[PDB]
Amino acid sequence: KWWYDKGECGAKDSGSKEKTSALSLSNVAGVFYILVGGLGLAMLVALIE
C-alpha cells in the first residue's frame, strides 16, 4: 500500500510506448565523417599521383 499503491510510479508495468522517434542523426554523423575522410584521402592520393 504505502510504497507501490501510494507511490506515483507505474514502473515495470507499461514497457514499450512504441518509441515514436524516426531516426536521429547521431547514427549518421560518424558515417558522414568517414565519408568526408574517404573523399579527402582520395583527393590527396589523386593529387600526389
Partner: protein, 51 residues
C-alpha cells in the same frame, strides 16, 4: 420493484480513433525530413568529385 426488463453494466468510453493515415507525408516518415537533403548534397558533392 418488478423484474428488471433492461439489464446493464459499467462500460468504457474512449476517443474512438479513426484511420488517419495521410499520403505523401507518411512516405518520408522513418528516417527524417532533413537527413535526405544532406544525402542529396553529399550525392551532388561526390558527383562533383567524380567530374
Amino acid at each position: 420493484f418488478s423484474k428488471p426488463f433492461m439489464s446493464l453494466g459499467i462500460s468504457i468510453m474512449i476517443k474512438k480513433p479513426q484511420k488517419s493515415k495521410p499520403g505523401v507525408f507518411s512516405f518520408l516518415d522513418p528516417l527524417a525530413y532533413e537527413i535526405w537533403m544532406c544525402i542529396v548534397f553529399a550525392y551532388i558533392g561526390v558527383s562533383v568529385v567524380l567530374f
